[PDB]
Symmetry: none
Subunit: 178 residues, 3 copies
């Protein structure tokens, strides 16, 4: 029940805490070569207790690189997301991001992967969807996951199809693996 | 199998978790009569993910207790504890920048009240998975005094390989429970 | 002596920074003739604030090179390098949760091609400040092979308190440059 133990951990954190912990997280993210040399980064739109991603998309758009959000039938496809002066509105769950652009995996250079629970070896507890569990076996680029330390555990229920994320960045440090 | 699990477990912990848990761990150890009364202590210089033993040494000298660390023989499985004179360079030592130097007149097992025993894995029965070379396996068999082990809950297991002529540690101190297997 | 400074300067370095610096040191090392041409390499298992050696052992093996680590004796300045076979638990060893299993297969000096010499304080002349044992100051005196020592700039000093006795290493190598000693 790692899903339960985390919901509690994340729930205990105050808006100030999360906002203060994620700052140092983005710091690490952006300080990686994988972020600097990335011309196209893939990412989801944060929600609830999911790590906030707005500062990521905004940063990317500020450095000219292109960003594509997911649009997930256990099949998931990524499509470019042109800069809009209403990203805030979108994160407020008051607008949809709006195609012929079926952006192939090979064209994206960095994959920011979402998750609920993580392992020290890159394994994760999905949201129940099952998309990021299969899209990774189709992907072969650089993958990373931003998460709080209260989301990181010793071991996570593995599956004969589970593919680990390459890097794990937290508010305290950063971790490598496969 | 177990050694590896304890690696992932100890790695998964944040620096805050560790700092926290080990803090209550030390309080427990310092609240015990065997420690309160111990006038000379045996302990090792921790490293890596091993439970940090710096505060155990500092607290000792702070209470005017003797402190002796282990001097292992890479020769055989023979080990011997030597008195360790209070050192202002303890910090420098626990950082790998200084090897702790009265190497004369060895400290006999009898002259050692308490003895913090380090280990990688432990079962609730006081049995443990050493670092290898089983230096303690034979030392403990010739030691009669009190023996307590500091460790985190993720180092504890239902059971570990116990091959005859293995002696369990009398006390286990973790982040939660305080096992006293006799 | 002034190794206190090295302690402060080292422990002050951005944790994430040491990783980046050690990298450049590694690249400098691996593209070296004295390295690519060495069959057997002497190195040590690093710890604490010392320079991380894992990448060096891991790389030595990946290029099918022999690797030997020390197993120096106590109360004496006797150090003898012994072969260390590819260890899939290498990470467990660096975590301090498993002593490196090596058994005794002595490797004489003339059998060592390249030797990574550990140190806390260095000077541009290849002179170093050991950890205290004085094993290297005694081993290097009778080693006629190549010697290289990796280190962060905050370890290198314009000059290190020497004494009329043991020799300095042949080549220094930091995160900024490589220094050949006369």
């Amino acid at each position: 029940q790692l899903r339960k133990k985390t919901l509690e951990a994340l729930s205990a954190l105050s808006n100030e805490d999360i906002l203060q912990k994620t700052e140092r997280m983005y710091k690490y993210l952006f300080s990686l070569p994988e972020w600097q040399n990335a011309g196209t980064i893939a990412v989801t739109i944060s929600r609830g207790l999911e790590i906030p991603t707005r500062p990521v998309i905004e940063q990317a758009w500020e450095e000219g690189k292109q960003v594509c959000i997911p649009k997930c039938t256990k099949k998931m496809q990524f499509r470019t997301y042109q800069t809009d002066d209403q990203l805030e509105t979108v994160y407020a769950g008051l607008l949809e991001p709006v195609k012929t652009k079926e952006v192939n995996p090979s064209q994206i250079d960095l994959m920011i992967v979402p998750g609920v629970c993580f392992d020290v070896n890159g394994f994760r507890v999905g949201f129940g969807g099952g998309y990021y569990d299969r899209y990774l076996s189709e992907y072969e680029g650089k993958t990373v996951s931003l998460l709080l330390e209260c989301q990181l555990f010793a071991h996570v229920p593995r599956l004969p199809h589970d593919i680990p994320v390459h890097k794990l960045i937290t508010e305290d440090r950063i971790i490598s693996c496969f």
